[PDB]
Amino acid sequence: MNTVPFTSAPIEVTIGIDQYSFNVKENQPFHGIKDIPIGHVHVIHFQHADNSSMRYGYWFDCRMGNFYIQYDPKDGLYKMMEERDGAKFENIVHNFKERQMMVSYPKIDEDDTWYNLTEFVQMDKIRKIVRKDENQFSYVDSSMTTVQENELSDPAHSLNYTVINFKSREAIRPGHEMEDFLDKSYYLNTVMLQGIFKNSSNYFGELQFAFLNAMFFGNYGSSLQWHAMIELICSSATVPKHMLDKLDEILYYQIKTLPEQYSDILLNERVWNICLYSSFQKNSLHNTEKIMENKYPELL
């Protein structure tokens, strides 16, 4: 079980760790999060009590280094840092644990929610979407734009999601205009899966990462990417059966986890009605259709 210690908590803040969250008071004796499950990526995220603008956070894997949080009073945020001295890090963690100044990652044994949301998400794929090669962890916030949003303004601070555009030369073979526009199978299977992603696991990883940035940061460009990657599969007549079955599992857990009160800002009416009721795959997403009809029948 790995640990992310905190130097201190000088400003009042809501701290997220994956799907969990904890309120910390100004100068509360808080020194971090222990018992973080090894085997998954994690996200540690923040929303300041005195300024709910910028949600921000860090994606990390405790297998890739020893990470801690320290508030920077100049830049006014909680920063993730890596501690390269192993024995120093172990001794800091041991002290804070002995003084019981850490919250425990509150995982229920029966509860596979975080695995279900991150099954295909790899830290190496996150670090290619979020480019800052000097750190092993990745900063994301509410305001970061995508390469696609930027095309339609600082490229070093962008989310490098794969660009999906249904009315683009990449999506439409000259001579197959009607075919490729009404049936996106070419674009999904040849361009995206065989060409860019190499396999469905990488495609699902990016879809899962987009959803999580949309949900945890209210990152609008990430929500656009999540819906575009769903629509691209649902709008293809030819999809491997294993991919349709896996997509239904992926979306079921995403809809299950979404806060009920954020459905209005996080779900695109057009895409979901098209995907569940009109598309080639309208009958392929039985679990997702059932949770959407029971949880969000207004949207539909």
Partner: protein, 237 residues
């Protein structure tokens, strides 16, 4: 964006533009079968592609053979239209290519956008104008070439005859839309107005009769009267 009453003079500026109307591409008669089911029979159609500044009409005849063994014909007709407009643009020299294509029906926007991806600087626009170009097949010489076609054919016309020798493009387009609106509303009455005086003929190289400036004023008044008469008959007003 959308072409409307506000930006009407834009149609007659020096930026090349075409109207595309797909109404008459897929044309059928509906009939009973022997077993008492209903079937369609396609007839030849046409794409109406018009330069409103110059009157140049690119009439692409759609021969019934293009529907043979195809499904979802009303959908396919939009994509075939877009395919043929794209082919016409590629056929024109660079300096003759349009800067804008205005579709009369919003269902043509996606098909035409996707066929024109190779031309990102040609704007594809809808219009809020209700244009009567469906009535093109009320112009006897256009109907005749469409019906006689035995294969796909492009036929070029000037839909303004020689009117631009005497009037502006704005006025010629206004006359054209008035004539087509009258032909759409009451074809028989409109044709009677146009052919009533035998001494006024249609030149071999024209679509419309050879009216003097004073006769065109009378004809235009009679067409307005027909349209108002028909509106009163329709609404009991």
């Amino acid at each position: 964006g959308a072409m409307n009453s506000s930006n009407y003079a834009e149609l007659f500026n020096n930026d090349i533009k075409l109207f595309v109307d797909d109404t008459n591409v897929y044309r059928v008669t509906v009939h009973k079968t022997f077993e008492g089911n209903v079937a369609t029979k396609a007839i030849n159609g046409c794409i109406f592609t018009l330069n409103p500044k110059t009157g140049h009409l690119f009439l692409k005849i759609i021969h019934t053979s293009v529907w043979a063994g195809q499904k979802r014909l009303s959908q396919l007709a939009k994509w075939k239209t877009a395919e043929e407009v794209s082919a016409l643009v590629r056929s024109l020299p660079k300096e003759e290519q349009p800067k804008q294509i205005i579709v009369t029906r919003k269902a043509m926007l996606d098909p035409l956008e996707v066929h024109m991806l190779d031309f990102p600087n040609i704007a594809i626009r809808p219009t809020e104008l209700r244009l009567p170009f469906s009535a093109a097949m009320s112009i006897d010489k256009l109907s005749d070439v469409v019906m006689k076609a035995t294969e796909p054919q492009m036929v070029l016309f000037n839909i303004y005859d020689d009117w631009l020798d005497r009037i502006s493009s704005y006025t010629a387009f206004s006359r054209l839309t008035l004539l087509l609106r009258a032909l759409k509303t009451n074809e028989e009455s409109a044709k009677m107005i146009l052919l009533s005086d035998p001494t006024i003929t249609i030149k071999s190289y024209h679509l419309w009769p050879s009216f003097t400036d004073e006769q065109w004023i009378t004809i235009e008044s009679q067409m307005r009267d027909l349209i108002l008469t028909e509106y009163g008959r329709k609404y009991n007003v």
